[PDB]
């Protein structure tokens, strides 16, 4: 089997069903002790939690679910009735994420869309009845951060106050996105220095709050 299947199996055998905190702990233990994986991790995860708690977003979009770690992290802090949509183009990973969410008992709060973000984002308004997004977590291919930001704005999915939170702005890095949001009068940006998941390597998150056109 694959690393991702091993992680799902480990969660299933080392966490309590319906207990998201135990699911996160199990994944963090697996990835620290057994096999590294590109989950946001606990160091950056704590920053994410602090952000989610500040803004209490009613609708969050996540680009790049992977195994569902960040989806569990975010969805567990959502208020009753609040929703997370997560896009994942790799069907194998989309299946892992759905199963991870089911195990955590968060399946009613999250929808996992199996496709490419550039194909699905234009469908959000008409097919998924989205008006605007309250928050967007960017954690997919790093060269897609800027193009999907620009696509979200073209699609009318951003509103004044929409929070963009971007992983890996240092490693692997997202130089074009970072330069763009920091230079644009349409974003107010904050850098949160942290560490690469499960590693003593500097990384960080960038928060970019959309200010309108
Ligand atoms: C257009 C589109 N649409 C839908 N899903 C999409 C999508 N593009 C990608 N995806 C999905 O998102 C995930 C992939 C995320 C890419 N993340 C990283 O590559 C990543 C890498 C590291 C890393 C750091 C140091 C290293 F030495 C090696 C790797 C750390 C990270 O935290 C990363 O996130 C993966 O699940 C992929 O299918
Ligand atoms: Cl993750
Ligand atoms: Cl990438
Ligand atoms: Cl700024
Ligand atoms: Cl960590
Ligand atoms: Mg990442």
Curated annotation (Swiss-Prot):
It is an enzyme of class 2 (transferase). Mg(2+) binds at residues 139, 167-168. It catalyses: a catechol + S-adenosyl-L-methionine = a guaiacol + S-adenosyl-L-homocysteine + H(+); 2-hydroxyestrone + S-adenosyl-L-methionine = 2-hydroxy-3-methoxy-estrone + S-adenosyl-L-homocysteine + H(+); 4-hydroxyestrone + S-adenosyl-L-methionine = 4-methoxyestrone + S-adenosyl-L-homocysteine + H(+); 2-hydroxyestrone + S-adenosyl-L-methionine = 2-methoxyestrone + S-adenosyl-L-homocysteine + H(+). Coiled coil: none annotated. GO terms for cellular component: axon; cell body; cytosol; dendrite; dendritic spine; glutamatergic synapse; membrane; postsynapse. The keyword DNA damage does not apply. S-adenosyl-L-methionine binds at residues 40, 62, 70, 88-89, 115-118, 139. GO terms for biological process: artery development; behavioral fear response; catecholamine catabolic process; catecholamine metabolic process; cellular response to cocaine; cellular response to phosphate starvation; cerebellar cortex morphogenesis; cholesterol efflux. GO terms for molecular function: catechol O-methyltransferase activity; magnesium ion binding. Its cofactor is Mg(2+). Binds 1 Mg(2+) ion per subunit. Residues 1-213 are extracellular. Its EC number is 2.1.1.6. Substrate binds at residues 142, 168, 197. The N-terminus is blocked. Keywords: Catecholamine metabolism, Cell membrane, Cytoplasm, Lipid metabolism, Magnesium, Membrane, Metal-binding, Methyltransferase, Neurotransmitter degradation, Phosphoprotein, S-adenosyl-L-methionine, Signal-anchor, Transferase, Transmembrane, Transmembrane helix. It comes from the Eukaryota. Belongs to the class I-like SAM-binding methyltransferase superfamily. Cation-dependent O-methyltransferase family. Catalyzes the O-methylation, and thereby the inactivation, of catecholamine neurotransmitters and catechol hormones. Also shortens the biological half-lives of certain neuroactive drugs, like L-DOPA, alpha-methyl DOPA and isoproterenol. This is Catechol O-methyltransferase. The gene is Comt.
């Amino acid at each position: 089997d694959t690393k991702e299947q091993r992680i799902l199996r480990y969660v299933q055998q080392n966490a309590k069903p319906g207990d998201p905190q135990s699911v996160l702990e199990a994944i963090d233990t697996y990835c620290t002790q057994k096999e590294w994986a590109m989950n946001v991790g606990d160091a950056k995860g704590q920053i994410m939690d602090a952000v989610i708690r500040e803004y209490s977003p009613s609708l969050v979009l996540e680009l790049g679910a992977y195994c569902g770690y960040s989806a569990v992290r975010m969805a567990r802090l959502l208020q009753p009735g609040a929703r997370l949509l997560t896009m994942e183009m790799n069907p194998d990973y989309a299946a892992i994420t759905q199963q991870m969410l089911n195990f955590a008992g968060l399946q009613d709060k999250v929808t996992i869309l199996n496709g490419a973000s550039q194909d699905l984002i234009p469908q959000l308004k008409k097919k998924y009845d989205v008006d605007t997004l309250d928050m967007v977590f960017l954690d997919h291919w790093k060269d897609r951060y800027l193009p999907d930001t620009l696509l979200l704005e073209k699609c009318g999915l951003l509103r004044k106050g929409t929070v963009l939170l971007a992983d890996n702005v240092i490693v692997p890095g997202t130089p074009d996105f970072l330069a763009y949001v920091r230079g644009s009068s349409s974003f107010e940006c904050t850098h949160y220095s942290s560490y690469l998941e499960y590693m003593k390597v500097v990384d960080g998150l960038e928060k970019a709050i959309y200010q309108g056109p």
